[PDB]
Amino acid sequence: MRLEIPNHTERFGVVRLHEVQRILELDSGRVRDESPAVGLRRLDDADLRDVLEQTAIVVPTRNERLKLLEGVLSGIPHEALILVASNSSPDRFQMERDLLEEFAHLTERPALIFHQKDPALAEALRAGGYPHPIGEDGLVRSGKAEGMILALVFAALSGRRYVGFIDADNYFPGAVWEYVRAYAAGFLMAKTPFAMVRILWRVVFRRYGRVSERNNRALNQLIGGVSGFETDVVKTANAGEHAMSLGLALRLPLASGYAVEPQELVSLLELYGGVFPLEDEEVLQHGVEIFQIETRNPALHENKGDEHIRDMLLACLATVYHSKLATEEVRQSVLEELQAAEEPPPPVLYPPLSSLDLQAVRKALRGHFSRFRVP
Amino acid sequence: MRLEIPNHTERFGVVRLHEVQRILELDSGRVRDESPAVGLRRLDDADLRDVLEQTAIVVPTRNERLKLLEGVLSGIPHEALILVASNSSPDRFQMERDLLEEFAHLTERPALIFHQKDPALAEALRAGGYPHPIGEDGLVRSGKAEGMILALVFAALSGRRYVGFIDADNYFPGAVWEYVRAYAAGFLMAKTPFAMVRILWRRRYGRVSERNNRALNQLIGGVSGFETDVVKTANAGEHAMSLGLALRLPLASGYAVEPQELVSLLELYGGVFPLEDEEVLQHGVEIFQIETRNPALHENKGDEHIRDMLLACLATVYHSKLATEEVRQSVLEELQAAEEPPPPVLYPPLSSLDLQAVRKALRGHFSRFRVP
Ligand SMILES: Nc1nc2c(ncn2[C@@H]2O[C@H](COP(=O)(O)OP(=O)(O)O[C@H]3O[C@H](CO)[C@@H](O)[C@H](O)[C@@H]3O)[C@@H](O)[C@H]2O)c(=O)[nH]1
Ligand SMILES: Nc1nc2c(ncn2[C@@H]2O[C@H](COP(=O)(O)OP(=O)(O)O[C@H]3O[C@H](CO)[C@@H](O)[C@H](O)[C@@H]3O)[C@@H](O)[C@H]2O)c(=O)[nH]1
Ligand SMILES: [Mg+2]
Ligand SMILES: [Mg+2]
Ligand SMILES: [Zn+2]
Ligand SMILES: [Zn+2]
Ligand SMILES: [Zn+2]
């Protein structure tokens, strides 16, 4: 895989936000004689594979068609560990286990499947002192974020060093394959243990674009509000397909809705933008790199209810508005746009996972790891 | 890449035609241990790439959009040589050379591009004593098959062992990438120098292909005297073959090109007629049909051609030296229901062509087929 090297990079405390890099060549082979281009970077196949041998890939699912979900699995590079974070109806779920069990047997590779609503998982989180996403039913709330939180735990428990997410509504297994290799690309290029790779692709769909352009703006306005100089650097406010080093995810709080992806950025700034005093010495001396990679394959998802467009505009502007770094002018610009689609709701934030006692969780799930695992 | 095992194989002379194989896992990583587990075939990445380093990938193009074309290019694995066989308007062709010169420069790889109406090529074919595809005007006729021919020549000259084709109208680089890897998968699975790989992806087009495959299966069954289900790639834009097999096959002009390939494999190597080719008689021919994970999504306009697809393919069969009265009739009934049938235009095998002559005749020119 060859990519553009980023022209400019946004320094913001110890955070480094790179501008969008295009993938030029999907598969650039096995190096042998290197040859140095300053303008782009060629990533060795072996190198990518080795990265993925340390990567977990999370496929979040709630009542997705089985054909699609198996399509997605077949696209994931062999080296990566598959975690299926499920929240489907019990019937559907048991079908998902069966599907994953067969795929993983046939392709001789380890996978993990678990259901968001497991009492054992709730029980485990309490034992680890992270009882924040547990609802009144006594069990973990519904939401994609909540599943991710659980997958992160599994990821941590499995000793994988990088985590990436991939939506299960993909029509194109080959686009999945590109996302996963792009994650690895980004982690190679990264020169810090703290790193995040966000993918973008460039009557109905035509309106999604004006929203993302406005979401992106809102975030650049935020950054500029601190910096004093205005920027266009962020192009990935929303990024369903994004990955981050495990060390970095345990460190970030995560919001709940369509606020999850944009809040990660807001959290990175608030934490490491060097406005507030920085606690973590390791982040202090390695810094953070955020990568924005633009993909060769068109994104094609299955949609079936698109009221959610207004909703995600709302969620992301809310984030920015409520950030501890938003200056009046930024808060105002965000108010006007919204009321232009008299009140602004605050996002729901779960504390960083670093807080969770892994040992306790581990103890909690002794008897059960058997059934999360598929051979 | 992990594939299913063909549930069954048609032996027809020294030809072996394998039943469709699904791709199960796009990228099966690096073997380091072993268990070819009864069910399936697992192909090492290293092996895949070593094959592709011997592969040319032809991309034919006639006024295709530049963005599409470059997308297709970005999808071709590094290891493969890119020949772009063009037949666009002369303005557009210059944009194409530009496009390719840039890509190949940036991604540090070699590529060839040629126009199908180049006088040097018509002249070179004549030098090699292959005057067959040259037109009235003194130039190689327009048509994809004519462009494919020219590519196979360039392929032969560049010393590559395998040629594959990829239509430039693809929306997905990843689909291209899967095609190219699947071609190498076939060539590895094969146990003979002479091997072919045919890709399929599973509204009016539906019936037509069902009926075209049926047409070949009836042809095949006609000779063996037992029915078969095996052909499912009667048409296959995206197909590859070992160069040794391609120089051995005659080629048809229309949409006829792909089906004829199979009709020709029967005629030549099914051993109804006597088989005179030491090497093919000793080694035999394997044909793979691989089913792809990625939906096919191309760009098309004014899709009338579905009918012309049917007529082309069923004509191939009708006029086979191996067609029986029954097949012939069956074929007529079908066409008639969409009183008189046309025989295809068939170019002789490229094996006859003198490359030494072509090499001589293309001296001062190779410089401009090759992009740095
Ligand atoms: N574990 C879990 N998974 C869920 C849940 N709800 C949905 N999912 C799964 O997670 C994905 C959510 O995708 P959609 O529900 O289709 O969301 P969207 O409207 O497509 O928005 C997506 O794309 C945006 C841009 O890429 C993202 O901003 C957003 O986060 C989401 O990924 C799907 O695979 C779905 O099956 C849940 O409560 N729990
Ligand atoms: N060199 C050359 N190329 C051509 C010519 N005409 C078309 N091409 C190029 O070769 C490919 C032919 O694609 P289409 O013209 O879209 O043909 P189609 O109707 O889409 O049918 C294709 O798919 C079928 C099944 O996959 C095939 O039956 C058929 O061969 C063809 O490849 C495209 O990249 C096109 O630009 C030509 O006269 N000369
Ligand atoms: Mg979706
Ligand atoms: Mg086409
Ligand atoms: Zn810039
Ligand atoms: Zn069969
Ligand atoms: Zn031999």
Side-chain angles (χ1 to χ4, degrees), chain A residues 1-303 305-375, chain B residues 1-300 302-372:
Chain A
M1 181 174 277
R2 221 163 299 246
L3 301 95
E4 284 171 339
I5 235 142
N7 193 17
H8 302 83
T9 300
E10 183 80 48
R11 277 107 79 251
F12 193 76
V14 293
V15 188
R16 292 186 153 254
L17 200 346
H18 301 105
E19 57 181 41
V20 170
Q21 295 175 268
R22 292 174 61 203
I23 290 160
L24 310 166
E25 187 184 39
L26 256 175
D27 182 12
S28 41
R30 301 172 291 190
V31 303
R32 286 77 183 270
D33 39 76
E34 176 273 349
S35 190
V38 321
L40 42 94
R41 258 191 63 177
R42 177 200 186 171
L43 303 138
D44 192 66
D45 170 71
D47 291 338
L48 292 151
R49 318 192 92 105
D50 301 339
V51 167
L52 296 176
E53 268 169 18
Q54 295 161 290
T55 297
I57 292 294
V58 178
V59 178
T61 185
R62 175 210 258 256
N63 311 305
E64 228 42 270
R65 301 168 82 242
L66 294 152
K67 285 155 199 133
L68 278 200
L69 173 68
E70 181 251 31
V72 161
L73 292 172
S74 84
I76 307 167
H78 186 86
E79 291 71 26
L81 180 64
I82 295 151
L83 331 187
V84 174
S86 169
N87 191 220
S88 328
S89 66
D91 267 52
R92 275 231 140 229
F93 173 67
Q94 176 62 49
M95 288 188 297
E96 301 169 332
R97 296 206 63 207
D98 284 357
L99 180 144
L100 187 65
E101 172 198 337
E102 182 162 53
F103 177 75
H105 170 69
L106 272 182
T107 51
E108 273 140 299
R109 68 194 277 185
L112 286 183
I113 188 173
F114 58 87
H115 192 284
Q116 195 155 330
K117 293 288 174 171
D118 207 319
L121 291 177
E123 223 312 289
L125 286 181
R126 248 193 235 304
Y130 195 99
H132 315 92
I134 310 167
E136 321 79 84
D137 46 326
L139 320 169
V140 185
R141 268 163 200 106
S142 315
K144 187 203 201 194
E146 282 79 352
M148 302 198 210
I149 293 170
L150 284 169
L152 282 184
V153 178
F154 279 101
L157 288 171
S158 71
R160 298 314 201 87
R161 189 193 187 284
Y162 303 105
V163 190
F165 302 82
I166 304 284
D167 279 17
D169 52 19
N170 234 296
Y171 275 114
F172 281 73
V176 169
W177 189 85
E178 190 187 11
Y179 307 144
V180 170
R181 295 281 280 219
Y183 299 159
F187 299 129
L188 290 162
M189 287 179 299
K191 287 184 228 190
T192 159
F194 306 124
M196 160 172 287
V197 170
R198 302 157 85 77
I199 313 297
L200 73 146
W201 180 67
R202 275 189 286 218
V203 182
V204 155
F205 285 70
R206 154 197 192 173
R207 243 165 197 171
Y208 171 90
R210 53 181 48 163
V211 165
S212 58
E213 277 178 15
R214 193 43 254 216
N215 276 5
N216 294 155
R217 201 135 109 272
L219 274 122
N220 296 310
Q221 304 197 323
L222 183 54
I223 287 144
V226 171
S227 101
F229 302 107
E230 72 159 296
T231 183
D232 208 349
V233 71
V234 170
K235 296 273 166 241
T236 56
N238 304 286
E241 279 59 48
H242 70 292
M244 65 199 143
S245 69
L246 191 90
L248 179 48
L250 298 165
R251 276 187 171 75
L252 253 27
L254 316 124
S256 199
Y258 288 101
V260 57
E261 285 113 56
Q263 177 75 235
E264 299 173 348
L265 290 173
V266 179
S267 293
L268 282 163
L269 305 204
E270 276 175 3
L271 282 181
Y272 307 136
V275 182
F276 306 142
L278 257 78
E279 290 304 63
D280 219 303
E281 253 115 345
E282 270 272 301
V283 174
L284 225 172
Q285 50 189 282
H286 294 269
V288 188
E289 275 173 79
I290 298 159
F291 283 87
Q292 305 176 284
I293 287 127
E294 176 177 32
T295 260
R296 280 282 182 177
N297 289 288
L300 258 62
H301 300 256
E302 198 184 48
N303 320 308
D306 296 293
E307 209 281 342
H308 306 134
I309 259 64
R310 102 187 277 100
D311 284 297
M312 68 175 99
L313 167 88
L314 160 75
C316 169
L317 275 62
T319 310
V320 167
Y321 183 67
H322 289 302
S323 165
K324 310 162 190 177
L325 299 172
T327 79
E328 285 288 39
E329 303 79 324
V330 177
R331 309 175 68 249
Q332 177 88 78
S333 170
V334 157
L335 281 157
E336 291 155 306
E337 205 77 338
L338 291 161
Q339 295 172 251
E342 306 194 311
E343 274 171 63
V348 162
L349 258 44
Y350 294 113
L353 264 175
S354 78
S355 83
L356 175 74
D357 180 349
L358 240 48
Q359 277 294 108
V361 182
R362 202 171 228 113
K363 196 203 177 168
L365 300 160
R366 287 200 78 185
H368 320 274
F369 236 101
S370 194
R371 85 183 169 206
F372 296 131
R373 205 172 307 114
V374 283
Chain B
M1 178 175 289
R2 219 167 292 234
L3 295 107
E4 275 169 354
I5 279 166
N7 286 148
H8 70 99
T9 309
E10 275 295 309
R11 276 131 63 250
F12 189 44
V14 294
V15 186
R16 281 89 200 195
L17 218 157
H18 297 109
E19 193 49 280
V20 172
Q21 290 172 276
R22 295 181 61 235
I23 293 169
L24 292 177
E25 171 173 49
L26 268 171
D27 185 9
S28 77
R30 291 172 301 196
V31 347
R32 263 135 191 241
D33 207 277
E34 217 82 43
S35 166
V38 298
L40 42 83
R41 301 273 150 85
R42 193 213 167 155
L43 300 151
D44 195 86
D45 172 69
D47 294 336
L48 285 165
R49 322 189 93 111
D50 293 354
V51 164
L52 283 186
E53 270 168 27
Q54 287 156 290
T55 306
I57 298 295
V58 176
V59 180
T61 171
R62 203 221 226 272
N63 309 309
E64 235 27 281
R65 308 190 301 102
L66 294 181
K67 281 170 166 159
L68 282 179
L69 166 56
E70 184 255 12
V72 159
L73 288 181
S74 70
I76 301 176
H78 172 83
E79 285 81 18
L81 184 59
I82 298 150
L83 333 186
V84 184
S86 168
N87 185 221
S88 314
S89 60
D91 270 329
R92 270 204 157 266
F93 177 66
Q94 187 54 36
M95 318 207 75
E96 288 166 346
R97 299 189 80 256
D98 289 346
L99 187 138
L100 181 71
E101 189 178 343
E102 176 156 42
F103 179 77
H105 179 70
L106 277 188
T107 59
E108 285 145 72
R109 65 196 281 188
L112 296 173
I113 176 177
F114 57 95
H115 203 286
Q116 176 180 331
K117 288 294 180 181
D118 196 318
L121 292 178
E123 229 312 72
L125 282 175
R126 267 264 188 56
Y130 199 89
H132 313 116
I134 296 168
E136 299 288 286
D137 58 341
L139 304 186
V140 167
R141 288 183 176 103
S142 300
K144 181 189 188 195
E146 285 69 3
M148 293 195 242
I149 275 149
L150 289 176
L152 302 179
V153 177
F154 281 102
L157 283 174
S158 69
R160 299 286 197 287
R161 221 183 181 282
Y162 304 104
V163 191
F165 308 78
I166 296 288
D167 284 8
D169 54 356
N170 226 298
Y171 277 119
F172 290 81
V176 178
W177 182 89
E178 176 184 30
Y179 306 141
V180 164
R181 298 281 282 206
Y183 297 157
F187 304 129
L188 287 169
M189 293 186 293
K191 293 162 204 163
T192 164
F194 316 105
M196 167 176 297
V197 186
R198 293 165 88 81
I199 311 291
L200 75 139
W201 174 69
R202 296 174 294 200
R203 197 186 174 177
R204 215 143 223 177
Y205 175 82
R207 319 156 152 101
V208 177
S209 40
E210 270 169 49
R211 181 58 231 210
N212 286 355
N213 307 310
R214 193 140 87 257
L216 282 123
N217 283 160
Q218 289 191 321
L219 183 71
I220 288 153
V223 183
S224 62
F226 306 98
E227 345 260 349
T228 176
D229 83 343
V230 89
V231 176
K232 322 265 202 299
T233 56
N235 318 265
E238 272 74 25
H239 69 283
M241 43 183 161
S242 86
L243 179 91
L245 170 59
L247 298 164
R248 281 182 179 67
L249 263 28
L251 296 160
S253 173
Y255 282 83
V257 51
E258 285 115 28
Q260 177 63 231
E261 291 169 354
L262 298 165
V263 169
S264 304
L265 280 169
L266 315 204
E267 295 203 349
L268 285 161
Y269 309 134
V272 182
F273 310 134
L275 165 41
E276 354 229 288
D277 185 323
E278 263 162 11
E279 278 279 348
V280 179
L281 211 177
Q282 175 46 58
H283 296 278
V285 190
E286 280 176 78
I287 299 162
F288 294 77
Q289 306 180 276
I290 295 162
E291 186 178 21
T292 251
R293 282 285 193 170
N294 288 291
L297 247 59
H298 296 239
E299 164 185 273
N300 25 65
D303 292 75
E304 218 276 5
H305 309 111
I306 246 62
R307 186 187 209 170
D308 304 297
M309 218 157 320
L310 186 81
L311 158 74
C313 179
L314 266 66
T316 310
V317 181
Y318 180 91
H319 295 283
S320 182
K321 288 166 226 151
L322 296 162
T324 69
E325 259 319 277
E326 288 75 11
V327 189
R328 258 212 272 278
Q329 189 59 42
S330 168
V331 163
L332 276 158
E333 272 162 342
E334 189 84 14
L335 285 154
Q336 259 149 57
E339 296 172 321
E340 211 217 340
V345 183
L346 215 71
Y347 287 126
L350 263 166
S351 56
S352 69
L353 165 90
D354 188 1
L355 288 162
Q356 274 283 90
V358 178
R359 217 169 211 116
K360 172 200 188 154
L362 290 172
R363 285 206 78 207
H365 308 274
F366 222 100
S367 173
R368 56 166 223 220
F369 302 122
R370 211 188 304 109
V371 299

